[PDB]
Every structure is written in C-alpha cells, then in structure tokens.
Paper text:
For the human enzyme, the l-prolinol and (R)-isomer configuration is the preferred configuration (i.e., 5). The phosphonate group of 5 does push further into this pocket than the phosphonate group of 1 or GMP, forcing the flexible loop (D137-T141) to move away. The movement of this loop triggers a further structural change, and this is between residues P168–V171. This loop also moves outward by approximately 1.7 Å. In human HGPRT, it is the phosphonate group attached to the carbon atom of the prolinol ring that enters the 5′-phosphate binding pocket whereas, when 5 is bound to TBrHGPRT1, it is the group that is attached to the nitrogen atom. In the human HGPRT·5 complex, the phosphonyl and carbonyl oxygens are coordinated to a magnesium ion and this sets up a network of bonds which firmly anchors this inhibitor in place. Superimposition of this complex onto that of the human enzyme in complex with the transition-state analogue, (1S)-1-(9-deazaguanyl-9-yl)-1,4-dideoxy-1,4-imino-d-ribitol 5-phosphate (ImmGP) together with pyrophosphate, shows that the phosphorus atom, the phosphonyl oxygens, and the carbonyl oxygen atoms of the inhibitor are located in a similar position as pyrophosphate.
Inhibition of hypoxanthine–guanine–xanthine phosphoribosyltransferase activity decreases the pool of 6-oxo and 6-amino purine nucleoside monophosphates required for DNA and RNA synthesis, resulting in a reduction in cell growth. Five compounds synthesized here that contain a purine base covalently linked by a prolinol group to one or two phosphonate groups have Ki values ranging from 3 nM to >10 μM, depending on the structure of the inhibitor and the biological origin of the enzyme. X-ray crystal structures show that, on binding, these prolinol-containing inhibitors stimulated the movement of active site loops in the enzyme.
Author numbering:
A (entry chain A): 3 to 102, 114 to 217
B (entry chain C): 4 to 102, 111 to 217
C (entry chain D): 5 to 104, 112 to 217
D (entry chain B): 3 to 103, 113 to 217
Write the structure that this text describes.
Amino acid sequence: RSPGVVISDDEPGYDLDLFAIPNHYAEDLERVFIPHGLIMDRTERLARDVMKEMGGHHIVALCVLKGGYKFFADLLDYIKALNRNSDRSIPMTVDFIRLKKVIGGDDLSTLTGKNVLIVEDIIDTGKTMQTLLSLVRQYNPKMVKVASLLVKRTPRSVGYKPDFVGFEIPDKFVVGYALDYNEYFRDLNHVAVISETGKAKYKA
Amino acid sequence: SPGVVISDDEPGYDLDLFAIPNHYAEDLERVFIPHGLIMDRTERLARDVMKEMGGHHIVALCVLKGGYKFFADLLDYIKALNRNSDRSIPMTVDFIRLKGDIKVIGGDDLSTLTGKNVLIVEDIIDTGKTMQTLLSLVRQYNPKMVKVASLLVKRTPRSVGYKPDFVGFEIPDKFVVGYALDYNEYFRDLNHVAVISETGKAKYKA
Amino acid sequence: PGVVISDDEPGYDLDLFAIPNHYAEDLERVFIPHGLIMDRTERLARDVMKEMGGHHIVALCVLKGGYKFFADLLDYIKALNRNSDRSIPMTVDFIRLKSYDIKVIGGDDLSTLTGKNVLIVEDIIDTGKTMQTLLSLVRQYNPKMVKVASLLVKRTPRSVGYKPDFVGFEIPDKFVVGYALDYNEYFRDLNHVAVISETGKAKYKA
Amino acid sequence: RSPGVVISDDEPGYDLDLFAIPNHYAEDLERVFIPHGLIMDRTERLARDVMKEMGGHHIVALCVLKGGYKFFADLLDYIKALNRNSDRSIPMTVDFIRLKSIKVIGGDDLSTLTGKNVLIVEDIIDTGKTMQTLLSLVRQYNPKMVKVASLLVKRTPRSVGYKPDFVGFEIPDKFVVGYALDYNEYFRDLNHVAVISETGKAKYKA
Ligand SMILES: Nc1nc2c(ncn2[C@@H]2C[C@@H](COCCP(=O)(O)O)N(C(=O)CCP(=O)(O)O)C2)c(=O)[nH]1
Ligand SMILES: Nc1nc2c(ncn2[C@@H]2C[C@@H](COCCP(=O)(O)O)N(C(=O)CCP(=O)(O)O)C2)c(=O)[nH]1
Ligand SMILES: Nc1nc2c(ncn2[C@@H]2C[C@@H](COCCP(=O)(O)O)N(C(=O)CCP(=O)(O)O)C2)c(=O)[nH]1
Ligand SMILES: Nc1nc2c(ncn2[C@@H]2C[C@@H](COCCP(=O)(O)O)N(C(=O)CCP(=O)(O)O)C2)c(=O)[nH]1
Ligand SMILES: [Mg+2]
Ligand SMILES: [Mg+2]
Ligand SMILES: [Mg+2]
Ligand SMILES: [Mg+2]
Ligand SMILES: [Mg+2]
Ligand SMILES: [Mg+2]
Ligand SMILES: [Mg+2]
Ligand SMILES: [Mg+2]
C-alpha cells in the first residue's frame, strides 16, 4: 500500500530563520526537517484513510506515550472533524500506554472485540511494535491497525511496516512534534535535526 | 479570579446550532461550553501560565485521561507564545494516572520534579481532594514551585475549599462530558463540553 | 433562527480573554468570542453545502465587513469538499455597496451570475434594506438561486422584514465591533466581536 | 534580507493521493506544489518579520484582490495573534483594491494612505511590472512608508528587477494554482498551491 511521504536521504531541510522557532532552542537545532503545517496536511489525509478502513465498528485509539501524544491528539481531532460533518460515524474510546512490558493503561480486556488503532510517533527497527502487537493480539480484538507518524529507512529493520504511515525518513535522529532528545525538544511543533551545540548541552 | 463564570440558570445551546458527532445525537441535552470558547479561554490561560511560570524550566504534568485535550491545547498555545517572543523556557512533559498517600500511576520518578516549575493540568476540579493530596505528595520532591491549571471548577458545597492557580470556567453542579471528559469512557471523542441526555445516561450506564 | 443572544446578556469580561493591548480601554465587553464564531460557522458551512452544493457556487463577499466571515465560511466549506465523495467547484467575487439605488463597485460582470448558485456573504443585517436591494439587482441576471449568509442579524423595530437564509447570531440593537466589523475603520483587527466602550467611541469618533 | 523559502526548479512536488484534495479537482491537478500547512508555517514567520519592521505606527494593510485574499486573511490572523499576546501593539486598518488593464478599482480614497505605514499584500510577483505600477500610484499620496508582501515570487529572466520586501516562497518559472491563485477563475477554492494538469488546463480553458 502507500509508503507515505518519502523524505530522501539527501533532503537539506530548511533554514531555521525561515520559520518561527522557539527562542530557547535557536542555537540547539540544525535544520527544520518537516514543517509542522506539513505534518497537519498529511495527518488530515491519514485521518480519512483511517476512517475508510475502520469506521464500521467501535474504535479504541491507543496512544503510545510519550512521543505519540501530539500525533495522537491531532489525528483524533481530524477524525472528530470527519465524524461531525457527515452522517456516517461510530463512537471512539481512547487509552494511553507507555512501554518499558506495558506501563499504566486500562486493562487490555477493553480491546477484545474492538477495532484497535495503535498510534505511534516513530518506527525504527520495528521490534517494539512487533512485540506490542503480539501482546495485543492475545486479547482478540476485532482488528488491530498501527498508525505511525514516521517510519525510518534503516538496515536494522526487522521487516515490520505499519498500516498508515505519515513520512518515511532517512536513518537520522530527529526531534520535535513530541519526539525528544533526553526529554527535551518535545515542546516544538516542527520536526527538526539537533545541532552539535544542541546534543552537548542536553547530553545525558 | 474564578475564570469564566457559567451560572446555574445558563440554558446552553441547542444541539442543532452546532456540528455534533451524529452517533451522540440522542445522548446529549445541550451544548454547555462550545469548543471554540474553550480555545479562546485556553489562549488567555496560556499567557497567564507563562507570565507566572516562564522564569524556569517547566515540567507539565497531564492528569490522564480527561486532561489530555486541555493539556494538548494549553501546551499548543504556550508553544505559540514561545516561538513568537524573545524570552521562553524549555518545557518537558509527563503523563500520570491517579488512584494516606495518593497512588500515582505511570510517570517518571518524581525526583524529575525536584527544582522545576511544575504545572499540573486537570480537566476538572470537583471536591478538590485529589489535587490537595497530589499537591501534598509533590511538595515532598521539592519543586521550585507547583501550580495547577484546571479547565473546569465545580461550584459545590462538598468542596474542601481548594482553588487552583489557573481556571478556565467555573460551572454549576451538573454532570458534563466532552472535550475528553467521559461518562464510562464515552464522549471523550466530542469537542464541545455538553450535558448528558437522559436517553444517553441510560444507554451508556455501566 | 441562529444563535439567539438576548438583550440582558452580560457578555464576557475582557480580562478573561486575549485582547490586543491597543484596544484594552476601548471595549466594554466581549460579546461573541472568536471561537464561538468559528463553531457556528462550521455548522453554517454544512447548511450551505446541503442547499447549494448541487450546482456551481459563486460566493460574493460584501466588503469590507464581510471579508472575515467570508474567509472563514469558505474555509469550512473547503474542508467539507476535500473530505466528501461529491463536491462542486466554487468561484469567488468581492463587492462594495455604495449609494446612488445600490451601486455594485468592483466585482465581475453580473452576467457571470446567470445560471449559478449565488451565495451573498454579509457581516450584518440591520434594517435589511441593503440586502433587499442587492437581491433585486441579482435576480435580474437569472441565477439558478441566490441565498444570503449573514454573520449577524439585528433585532429592530426598523427592520423592513428581510430575513437571510443563513444566520450566525441574532443580536440586540447594540453597536458591535470586531471580526472585521468597524467603527470609523477601527476594530477590524480584532478576532472577537465586542461592544464598543464610551471611551473608545470618543477616542475614534470620526 | 530573506529571499524566502527557495523551491528549486527540479522540485518534484507531492503526489495528490498523499493529501486531501477537493473532489471536483481530482483530475484537474498534477501535483501538490506547496502544502497549505507549509504556507501557514511560512506566513507565521512573515507576520513576525512584518511586525518587527512596520509595528511602530498605524498600519494600513492593502489587499490586492482577488489572488491576495487568502494570504491577506492568514497574514492578518497571524499579525493579530502577535498583537494580543504581547504588551505593546499598534492598530491596523484594511483596504481592498482590484487592478484592471494600470487602473485601481474600488478601494478607499488613496488619501487615506498619507502618512500611514502601508503594507501591500500580494499573492504573486512575476515580472514585477504590476507592482511597480501600483507603487508608483501609492507613492503620489505620500505614505510614511510602503512595503510589499508577496506569498510567491517567480525566478524568471522576465523580471524587470523589482523585489518585494517580504517573500514567502521563491518558485520556478512555471504556472501554479490554489490558495486563491486561479486559472480562468477556477482553483481559488483550494488550500494547497498546485500545478494544473492537462485535463485541467483544457477543462477550464478560456
Ligand atoms: N526522538 C527520536 N527518537 C528515536 C529516533 N529513532 C529512534 N528513536 C527511538 C524510538 C523511541 C522508541 O523506540 C521504538 C522504536 P523500534 O521500532 O526500534 O523498536 N524512542 C523512545 O525514547 C521511546 C520513549 P518516548 O520518547 O516516547 O517517551 C527513541 C529519532 O530519530 N528521534
Ligand atoms: N466527565 C465528568 N467527570 C466528573 C464530573 N464531576 C466529577 N467528575 C469526576 C471527576 C474525575 C475524578 O476526579 C475527581 C476530582 P475531585 O477530587 O476534585 O472531586 N472523574 C474521573 O473519572 C477520573 C478518571 P478519568 O475520566 O480522567 O480517566 C469523574 C463531571 O461533571 N463530568
Ligand atoms: N460595525 C458595526 N456596523 C453596524 C452596526 N449596526 C449597523 N451597522 C452598519 C451596517 C454596515 C452597513 O450595513 C447596512 C445594512 P441594512 O441596510 O440592513 O441596515 N455598515 C457599514 O459601514 C458598511 C460598510 P463596511 O463597514 O462593510 O466597509 C455599518 C453595528 O452594530 N456594528
Ligand atoms: N494563478 C497564477 N497566476 C500567474 C502566475 N504567473 C503569473 N500570473 C498572473 C499573475 C496575476 C497578475 O499579476 C501580474 C504579475 P507581474 O506584473 O509581476 O508580471 N494574474 C491575475 O490574473 C491577476 C488578477 P486576479 O486573479 O488576482 O484577480 C495572473 C501563476 O503561476 N499562477
Ligand atoms: Mg514511540
Ligand atoms: Mg525518546
Ligand atoms: Mg481529572
Ligand atoms: Mg471521568
Ligand atoms: Mg455589510
Ligand atoms: Mg462599517
Ligand atoms: Mg495579483
Ligand atoms: Mg486570474
């Protein structure tokens, strides 16, 4: 199916001075990699693709924190827009989980017999998603799909690819739009690349 | 300031004046606080948060699940301030569920709060007992400061008298849903704050 | 009939909202918050598409007061049309009404309206005289249909009885500014609709 | 100064199936050239640049219809957002004009521009001859300053040498539509900037 918006390995990105950038990170980012408004435009379209394939039965939206919170909130807002401007709509429930083994959610028995949409910020090797999916399938959901904002082109991939992708990106470390570098850079609406100064100041 | 005061005799708006998810058509009586009104109030709240807390690294604490919309929209408005001004501060986020010492579920170690400007984000304050006990727990990790932003505060004689630092709307003692406030997990997928209908209370009764 | 706002409606305190500093002392109350304007306009866009979405739409913006409603109304119409399975193209036009009965300045040859679904977008209907007259001028070129969306309709004893087809809000006979509604060319740069204070009315009096 | 966002001559664009596109233009478009969200992000930064240079005196924002209305609306929305989330801000008035094949159609009296800070807002500069002509008329009325913002500037050898003060994007010498930019009045109702396809150039040709 669709592999998303392909960002080539040689993408230059954009000069920071062409966009509005948080003052505290000005010296800490290299380039803007994916502008926030382009994330919205892509997400809008994924929202329609999601409803096409899953609007026929109750959806349980499952946000993988922390990185996924922003993508999850905006994906859901566009899905909500679809549901209030059209005759066809089905209820949605939401839940949140963090991965260490699953940390702090509803009991997974809520997923049984439901359309489960797992929402992720990034897929790298895909090992984590494979592991979460084999766990979720033990609870017998009607169906389980994975929406991920980014998929990284990496040789370390184990072969997993999600059902809805936003962008496919080089094997580069990106921050922003809730993706972090040691907890920092979540408070940034663009996806960006850290500068050298940057990763020093916030090294662990 | 108690925020935007909605009075006990406010009728709210007929469902037909607004766009409503069709599957909740029968289950809501009135729209209580339209989404765009929530946005406008949150915009102001974002400015008051930065004026008081912008001096030092903020840790924003979302109280799941009901707080997640208010949290994302408040942080969105704070982000918009920080990329359009000459002074801002880094801000990290964490998410927690709450169930005597209050049981905090998930979350980083609370030592991550030591010495930070901590902001707790809540969907609604009712008796105040939950924030009072969470505050009592957080102060023991020695934050620089700790403050609470709540979209909604209920006027109730059952209040233990706790007032949060930032409040969107002060509302009557009525059960409201929407904007991530649920009735048995339903109605989170609704952008307006609304009052639950009678058919809908029975239809979704646990 | 649209969102009805009553005579004794208080409005909202300026300090609960974000307000441009240069107008802080010039307004008495926020009358209709921006975000509430948007919520109603989303719904109106759906009515428009249902009634006129079957044939080419020509949307006519009545400058200057209409430009803000017009832009937002059309943006919610575009949002429907890239998320439906059957949409229709729309073209746009802009006009100003000058006396000496009504002169249509700017805008295309009215022959372009023949056979089209014509939507006239207006900021406020006061007496209804302007709209009645423009309608009679447009019906002369034989549009497939002509409809009026007005953001505001005033309640008045001096109304000549014209009623638009789509109404945002029905309001008292107060003097409101904001959201592109002006006083002596001022207050167009303000997202909320507000009532003008006495200080402000003197400060900008022509 | 900022030459704006430089879109190369070889830029491939994006496939239409990766974005939400109006149904009725499905076949009429080749690629998305500049997504609506990119335009927004860039405009947000032009609003800060505009304010930093013109924000010390009453601004008259002059929208050149019809192509400029979208960019005008969004630029002024980002400017308003700055003015209500900072301590100090300056008032702003708006006028609209249309050009005919040299002749300024509509608009207030050009004397309303004397001593003002005039911001002319344009969708596209190509040769620049029209902007030079417009400036030559505005300058007869002695503005305090006059500046031009253009969403798009074409890299063309046919350029007469004129450069605007604020530029969103520097684009190839090729024909784009959307975001109010039209082809025989069509494609204005589209939020992305895009390249017309063959079916489309033929379907709406003059
Ligand atoms: N910011 C950023 N993170 C990247 C990037 N590449 C890989 N990662 C990892 C990806 C994710 C989890 O890994 C599963 C992937 P897998 O498919 O390989 O198993 N991480 C977490 O820290 C989770 C905790 P959170 O932050 O959500 O609280 C960092 C990148 O380019 N940028
Ligand atoms: N939807 C809605 N809930 C209301 C309303 N009144 C009171 N509540 C409570 C508020 C909260 C508990 O907090 C007590 C705070 P208190 O200590 O100050 O009394 N609840 C939860 O279910 C938390 C789990 P969540 O849903 O977040 O996952 C229900 C109302 O009108 N509407
Ligand atoms: N701001 C504001 N104006 C009000 C209010 N009440 C009445 N008006 C009038 C209404 C409008 C003309 O409309 C008459 C339609 P009528 O024939 O039905 O009475 N005006 C214009 O100045 C048009 C030129 P513009 O401003 O678009 O360039 C002012 C109010 O409360 N607030
Ligand atoms: N859509 C689109 N138009 C382009 C493109 N290249 C040039 N044009 C022209 C540009 C403009 C006039 O401006 C002259 C600029 P110049 O003097 O600097 O050479 N036009 C109008 O039709 C104005 C009436 P409007 O439609 O606004 O009411 C079309 C392009 O790529 N796409
Ligand atoms: Mg993740
Ligand atoms: Mg991480
Ligand atoms: Mg709560
Ligand atoms: Mg609850
Ligand atoms: Mg008018
Ligand atoms: Mg007027
Ligand atoms: Mg032009
Ligand atoms: Mg043209």
